[PDB]
Amino acid sequence: KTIIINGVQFNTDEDTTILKFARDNNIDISALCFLNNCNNDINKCEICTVEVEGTGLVTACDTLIEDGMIINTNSDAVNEKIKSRISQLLDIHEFKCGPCNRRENCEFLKLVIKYKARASKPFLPKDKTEYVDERSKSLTVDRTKCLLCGRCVNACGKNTETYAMKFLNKNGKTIIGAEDEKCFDDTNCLLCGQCIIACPVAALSEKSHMDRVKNALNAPEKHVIVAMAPSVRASIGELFNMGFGVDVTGKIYTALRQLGFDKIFDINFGADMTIMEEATDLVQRIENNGPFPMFTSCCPGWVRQAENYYPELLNNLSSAKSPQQIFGTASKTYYPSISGLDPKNVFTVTVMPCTSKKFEADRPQMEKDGLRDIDAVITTRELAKMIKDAKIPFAKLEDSEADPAMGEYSGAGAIFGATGGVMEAALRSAKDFAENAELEDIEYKQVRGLNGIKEAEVEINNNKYNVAVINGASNLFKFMKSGMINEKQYHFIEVMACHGGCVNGGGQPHVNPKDLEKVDIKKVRASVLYNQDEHLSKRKSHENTALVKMYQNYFGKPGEGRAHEILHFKYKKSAWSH
Numbered sequence: 001k002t003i004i005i006n007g008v009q010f011n012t013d014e015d016t017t018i019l020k021f022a023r024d025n026n027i028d029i030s031a032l033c034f035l036n037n038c039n040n041d042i043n044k045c046e047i048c049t050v051e052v053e054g055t056g057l058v059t060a061c062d063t064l065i066e067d068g069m070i071i072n073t074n075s076d077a078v079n080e081k082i083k084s085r086i087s088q089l090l091d092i093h094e095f096k097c098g099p100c101n102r103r104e105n106c107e108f109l110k111l112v113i114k115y116k117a118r119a120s121k122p123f124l125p126k127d128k129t130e131y132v133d134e135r136s137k138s139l140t141v142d143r144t145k146c147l148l149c150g151r152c153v154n155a156c157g158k159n160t161e162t163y164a165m166k167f168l169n170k171n172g173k174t175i176i177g178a179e180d181e182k183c184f185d186d187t188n189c190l191l192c193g194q195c196i197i198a199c200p201v202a203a204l205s206e207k208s209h210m211d212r213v214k215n216a217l218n219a220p221e222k223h224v225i226v227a228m229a230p231s232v233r234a235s236i237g238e239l240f241n242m243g244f245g246v247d248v249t250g251k252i253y254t255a256l257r258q259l260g261f262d263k264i265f266d267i268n269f270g271a272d273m274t275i276m277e278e279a280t281d282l283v284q285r286i287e288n289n290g291p292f293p294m295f296t297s298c299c300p301g302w303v304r305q306a307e308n309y310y311p312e313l314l315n316n317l318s319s320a321k322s323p324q325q326i327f328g329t330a331s332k333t334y335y336p337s338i339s340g341l342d343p344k345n346v347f348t349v350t351v352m353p354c355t356s357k358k359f360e361a362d363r364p365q366m367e368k369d370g371l372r373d374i375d376a377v378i379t380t381r382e383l384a385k386m387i388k389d390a391k392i393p394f395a396k397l398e399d400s401e402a403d404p405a406m407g408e409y410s411g412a413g414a415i416f417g418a419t420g421g422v423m424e425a426a427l428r429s430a431k432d433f434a435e436n437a438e439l440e441d442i443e444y445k446q447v448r449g450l451n452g453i454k455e456a457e458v459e460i461n462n463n464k465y466n467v468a469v470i471n472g473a474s475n476l477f478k479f480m481k482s483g484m485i486n487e488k489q490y491h492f493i494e495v496m497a498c499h500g501g502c503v504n505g506g507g508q509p510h511v512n513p514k515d516l517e518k519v520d521i522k523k524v525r526a527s528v529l530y531n532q533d534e535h536l537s538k539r540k541s542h543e544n545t546a547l548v549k550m551y552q553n554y555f556g557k558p559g560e561g562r563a564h565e566i567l568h569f570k571y572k573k574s575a576w577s578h
């Protein structure tokens with residue numbers, strides 16, 4: 001073929017789009033509607049408009065390149081078209097970058113600044129109670145910001161295949177939301193927040209728990225514990241312009257101490273706990289040989305998915321609480337027993353890459369003695385804001401350490417944040433448990449990677465068992481619907497709602513669609529975790545000294561009596577009715 005773009009001739013044989021072919025060279029083409037190799041098929045943004053000699057203005061997103069084409073990307077007509085579309089977008093956009101939370105990384109602001117567009121009538125409503133949906137424990141919607149972009153809808157479509165995010169005809173207007181515009185919590189939505197991740201504006205956000213944190217930090221009698229997720233230490237640095245794949249653990253600890261937090265712990269400790277329990281009940285599930293298989297229950301999105309699509313699998317879920325909740329359970333029981341704190345005056349805060357964790361911490365039965373397990377959950381973005389508003393020079397902070405009592409962790413817990421991490425961590429301990437032997441080879445590298453469905457065979461104590469790692473909700477839907485589950489007898493299965501693991505959660509830093517061509521965000525984020533794993537001396541959850549101490553002096557032996565009654569939570573399917 002022969003292509004002419006801006007006068008320059010290209011000879012190629014690639015069968016792609018104009019946008020892609022131009023971006024594989026250095027021809028700039030603005031785009032808003034195009035993401036995840038999909039565009040809004042109904043009201044196309046036409047931001048990627050170019051001019052094909054003989055045809056006219058076309059959208060480069062969904063236009064295949066052909067011989068004889070002469071393309072213009074910056075002719076007068078093209079830019080008047082784009083400026084037109086952007087102005088039209090501004091006509092329904094409250095561009096009060098006044099207190100906006102997408103200010104420092106908004107794509108729409110970038111487009112407006114680029115083409116210098118202005119609205120014909122500035123959109124400024126008296127009340128916004130009509131445009132705002134904050135009923136959800138995990139999600140908030142601000143339609144004063146929405147561009148009717150479709151990117152959220154497509155993202156939900158391809159990450160979950162649930163279509164919990166729909167287009168809706170709300171009394172004349174076209175909006176986005178849930179089934180019958182009810183609250184997301186009340187639908188089949190997984191609250192995985194991958195809607196937020198694909199959103200270019202402040203239209204979709206996480207339900208904020210920041211004031212919840214401050215009102216505890218300023219409360220005199222309130223002793224505020226804080227513990228972060230595995231992924232956070234490998235992601236938050238991005239929001240402070242530090243680059244991709246940077247370990248900022250010590251910096252995080254320092255910032256948390258500078259924010260007024262009374263105790264610095266880590267959710268990886270709880271990941272080690274979850275491994276203790278889960279490996280134990282895996283083995284007592286072994287020489288019972290049932291009920292097989294056993295699914296992981298640490299991902300709240302996968303939990304909600306099961307409840308809404310496969311409740312007959314709820315009994316096959318592990319009764320062991322997720323790292324967050326199993327940490328919260330110990331911080332209100334065991335931690336006062338080694339600190340002398342009135343447990344009622346204890347306030348546990350987790351830093352998460354997830355948004356579903358909010359819905360998981362506000363579950364009615366996540367209590368004992370009236371006391372919550374987790375009182376507040378903030379995301380990576382929330383922690384970043386909370387740091388910036390305190391004007392804490394994060395990128396230049398020196399490294400601290402957490403508090404060891406429930407803060408130190410093993411390499412097994414360190415890789416939870418990746419897909420296949422829970423699998424590997426569980427196997428390392430379960431094998432030693434069943435064989436009564438401290439094995440040396442602990443790296444299970446078949447379950448790693450970004451493949452959708454991963455399968456492996458392992459032999460625990462001279463007997464072979466089949467394990468599977470599901471990487472993404474849509475992949476769970478595929479794994480079940482395509483009958484792969486009823487192929488071979490599976491024995492242990494890991495499911496993560498977000499493709500790539502928790503490192504790609506709904507509460508993670510928004511990455512520009514023009515840094516994504518450069519960086520494999522999932523692998524780059526996971527790299528830190530996998531390195532932390534190997535450079536740690538203790539690489540198994542039952543090798544965490546603090547955890548062991550905890551188990552001997554409070555919980556007793558795992559999977560039993562005390563440990564079972566306090567540290568576990570099981571899901572019950574609704575009984576048959578009509």
Ligand code: 402
Pocket residue numbers: 228229230231232267268270271298299300322323324325352353354357416417418422502503505
């Ligand atoms: N609780 C919990 Fe987990 C742990 O530890 C996080 O904290 Fe994950 C991460 N990173 C998230 O969000 S959840 C499901 N499993 C694997 S990792």
Ligand code: SF4
Pocket residue numbers: 093094095096097100101102103104106107108109145201202203
């Ligand atoms: S969401 Fe972005 S474009 Fe919209 S007002 Fe806020 S900063 Fe400006």
Ligand code: SF4
Pocket residue numbers: 145146147148149150151152153176198199200201203204
């Ligand atoms: S909420 Fe965001 S991603 Fe979804 S259509 Fe509106 S602007 Fe696009």
Ligand code: SF4
Pocket residue numbers: 155156157159160162163164165184188189190191192193194195196
């Ligand atoms: S949280 Fe997940 S399932 Fe719910 S609308 Fe967003 S992408 Fe879809």
Ligand code: SF4
Pocket residue numbers: 191192298299300301302353354355356357496497498499501502503504505506
């Ligand atoms: S995979 Fe991790 S970040 Fe995504 S919904 Fe599950 S727990 Fe949350």
Ligand code: FES
Pocket residue numbers: 031032033034039040044045046047048059060061062
């Ligand atoms: S980016 Fe091509 S129509 Fe939206």
